[PDB]
Write an enzyme that holds these catalytic residues in place. Structure first.
Site, PDB file in Angstrom:
ATOM      1  N   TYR A 204     -35.475  62.457 -13.306  1.00  0.00           N
ATOM      2  CA  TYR A 204     -34.562  63.458 -12.747  1.00  0.00           C
ATOM      3  C   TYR A 204     -33.661  64.104 -13.777  1.00  0.00           C
ATOM      4  O   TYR A 204     -33.496  65.320 -13.744  1.00  0.00           O
ATOM      5  CB  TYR A 204     -33.731  62.818 -11.638  1.00  0.00           C
ATOM      6  CG  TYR A 204     -33.044  63.791 -10.713  1.00  0.00           C
ATOM      7  CD1 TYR A 204     -33.753  64.432  -9.697  1.00  0.00           C
ATOM      8  CD2 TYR A 204     -31.671  64.003 -10.789  1.00  0.00           C
ATOM      9  CE1 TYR A 204     -33.106  65.248  -8.773  1.00  0.00           C
ATOM     10  CE2 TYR A 204     -31.011  64.800  -9.854  1.00  0.00           C
ATOM     11  CZ  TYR A 204     -31.736  65.422  -8.852  1.00  0.00           C
ATOM     12  OH  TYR A 204     -31.107  66.241  -7.949  1.00  0.00           O
TER      13      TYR A 204
ATOM     14  N   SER B 104     -28.008  69.972 -10.851  1.00  0.00           N
ATOM     15  CA  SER B 104     -27.247  68.779 -10.513  1.00  0.00           C
ATOM     16  C   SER B 104     -26.228  68.569 -11.588  1.00  0.00           C
ATOM     17  O   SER B 104     -26.455  68.974 -12.724  1.00  0.00           O
ATOM     18  CB  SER B 104     -28.198  67.567 -10.493  1.00  0.00           C
ATOM     19  OG  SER B 104     -27.575  66.293 -10.366  1.00  0.00           O
TER      20      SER B 104
END
Lengths: 264, 264, 264, 264
Positions: free
Chosen positions: A167, A154
């Site tokens: 995350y 990401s």
């Protein structure tokens, strides 16, 4: 004569006849990458936890002449991953490409997020990348033909965000795990290991798009020099490039799929 | 149905029929990229300062059925760049892809490097990137069909080096100039602007390779997870990827062509 | 016994009796850093182009017992910089610390920004850093006592911005020039060279703060985890830290003074 | 008048009377930071797993007039961390500064490193940072006076290494956890959260220093523009800077303590 061959240039982007194992195959990016590998002529082995969704993809792909199969496995479960790779090898003889697209998130501020909730993200989103990469790399070593690993991380692997202590730790860590895996595998075994760092998908934000109280959609748009949010199809080119001979020198990289979010 | 089209996947890496303008075309990377675009079916317009070397390339490429032409220009000279782009437009009708590969270096410690010597590197290696990008971007804007710009920088755009106060300032600056150009052009005009950051070529170091007193070759090898120094052909895949529809979402990126030198 | 000394800890942040040469001394950050060095007991030599503003600062500082002086010089002018350093050496005997705070910007899109306008930013904002650092480093080498150089760049040295092809090239380049200068000077001569990368000052944006049509103030605030824009006084601690024994091991770093803008 | 106060400058680096909680207090860096905070006038609360080593430090520091105490706790165990913070609050009334220095590593290639061995590093080196930061941040929130958190990561948080799939995932993750924690806490609660990224200590490599078969020592020296390996005392300045008013604007940063290893 200039040191570049026509045969090399004409076929460098090919994945034809290669066996591509895609994790998180039923997810937004996973289903798109699986079909793109199929359309590009690869043998596709899809894995995920939802059997009905994998069966639906296999039926759709086979109706378009794609050679594909599936295996149900929890990617954080070492025994299930091992059995899944064995089933892929039994079906296709080998594994040449691995695309890691599975994951999990549940944003919550550190003050309200229990250690168990943080650990849940780490197990589902980070440990699972180690498990899949270790077992597929071992299979590629056993084969002795090299291979390609593409981990989807990401843009959050490089930029923090409120509520993302789980995350961001997982993605930040996975980017470094990729660079260290390249150090462990690329020179000795010819296994390239790279990550792609995408921005958010348009479809992930359409729900709260009509809410004036929400700044999420505009916060991302102000920070996208490309001028729009991403679609999963926007990352198929980078994934296939990193899965082909065209990227043979490229290893341990964390590729920017942010549309300029990382560089503005 | 999965949101990806076969027609998109089959043709995404194509540069066929596109006009690729390559600067530094007679250099180690420039001649290789120029021929790779030609083999991939692009119309190639080569530019550089050495007419005899450009003529030799044009004769070699035409003997292999490549549609190519050349224009002599100093890339740091606005007037010569403007005339060179006019000649490319006259020959091929437009410019679709720009690959900037020219440059200059003369390493020297800051204490021994005059302000004039530092400025010489900045003019030849940095100002010339601004000149070529500005004039080609203006031509792409005038055309109204978008375009692709690929600037070849260096892994030195992100890591300093003894004697490189000129070259590192120029490459470090060019990486940021690329991200800022993407902010200026990508959303409004559909012009993607990216850089590639290569490591050194094996041929650049073959001279002192047999000298035990030199640590250069081994210094790089210890820092190359890929296990070898680069060849210009190792970057043709990334350059063509960034020049095709496969990278339509990718802009303002500084792509890692270091073989892991940047991430270890 | 634990390997740390009380004498070291008690005096590590001191700049007392050190000669600090500050460029851009009449600017928002320059005047604040000059006074902070003075309040911390350093001998302050201020330089800039405006004699009346330098005289006003010298009068204010002397009224508070600060030992200071000034020298008028254009920092891009090699002869004027050389004469200015000679005047500082004549006044104080040496130069121990250099803080580079001068600069220039004029944002303009690449399509509307002439090559001459881009070059003007590069000369005023980038070449001037090379000139000052080269001449002060030569003076520090001549002295044989080591030294500290602190270059104020910007968070724009790492992130592009629309209209900033000049400024981002200059700052992006200066960050790499700093890392390369550390490679040239730190081990051999004991000269540490570092940069600080600040976000914008609140006072730079107050003018258009009451304009609802402007998104500038809010675009920055959304991206400031610290929760407010900067004041020049917010960077005096980092500048003095990088100018003291407390940072003796720190060299070639580009220090994050962004308030989290660079990491979110 | 210039906008900087003498009272601010004179006291900005102070940690006098502040309560500093140091984890990994018996380790090479932990004992040095613990004593440095003590010499700087902070009240020091040391934590670690080895009671005999904590008792030896407490006796040494008290003999020099340092106000200190200790609490035994495994930093990966929420219950033990919670009880340890309660004991620090009972002794000193509050916690103002947290320095996280504990950790664990066991390098091993991915092919030979079991999932359990990778998880062991993640629990000891990464989960423990989340546990300590979450519980101390909650105590700082409860107090309502803000606070400072300094997490010691490594230059391995940004650069991979052969055998480091565990440690690089943990440190790479911790750097992002720090940026995300700053997003969660700094604006609302006045809690700054930063990391320091050190290179290796000279003492860590003295074992194989005389073995010609080992390249480790020279591999690092070639990559250290500062010209030497680090001592724990080399990072006390940065740690105290990030624990004082001098760094009030600094949050979510991953500070370069690499001696130039990160930027060359």
């Amino acid at each position: 004569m200039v040191n570049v061959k026509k045969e090399f240039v004409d076929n460098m982007f090919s994945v034809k006849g290669k066996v591509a194992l895609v994790t998180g195959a039923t997810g937004a990016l996973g289903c798109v990458l699986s079909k793109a590998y199929g359309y590009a002529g690869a043998k596709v082995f899809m894995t995920g936890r939802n059997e009905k969704k994998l069966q639906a993809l296999e039926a759709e792909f086979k109706a378009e002449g794609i050679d594909c199969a599936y295996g149900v496995a929890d990617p954080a479960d070492e025994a299930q991953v091992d059995a899944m790779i064995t089933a892929c090898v039994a079906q296709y003889g080998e594994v040449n490409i691995l695309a890691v697209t599975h994951g999990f998130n549940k944003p919550q501020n550190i003050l309200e997020q229990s250690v168990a909730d943080w650990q849940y993200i780490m197990d589902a989103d980070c440990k699972s990348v180690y498990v899949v990469c270790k077992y597929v790399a071992q299979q590629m070593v056993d084969q002795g033909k090299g291979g390609k690993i593409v981990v989807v991380t990401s843009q959050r692997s490089k930029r923090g965000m409120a509520g993302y202590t789980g995350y961001c730790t997982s993605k930040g860590g996975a980017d470094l795990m990729v660079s260290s895996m390249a150090c462990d595998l690329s020179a000795k075994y010819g296994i390239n290991v790279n990550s792609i760092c995408p921005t958010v998908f348009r479809s992930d934000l359409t729900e709260w798009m009509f809410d004036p109280e929400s700044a999420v959609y505009q916060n991302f748009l102000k920070r996208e020099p490309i001028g729009r949010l991403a679609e999963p199809e926007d990352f198929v080119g980078y994934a296939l490039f990193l899965s082909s001979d065209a990227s043979n020198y490229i290893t341990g990289a964390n590729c920017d799929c942010s549309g300029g979010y990382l560089t503005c």
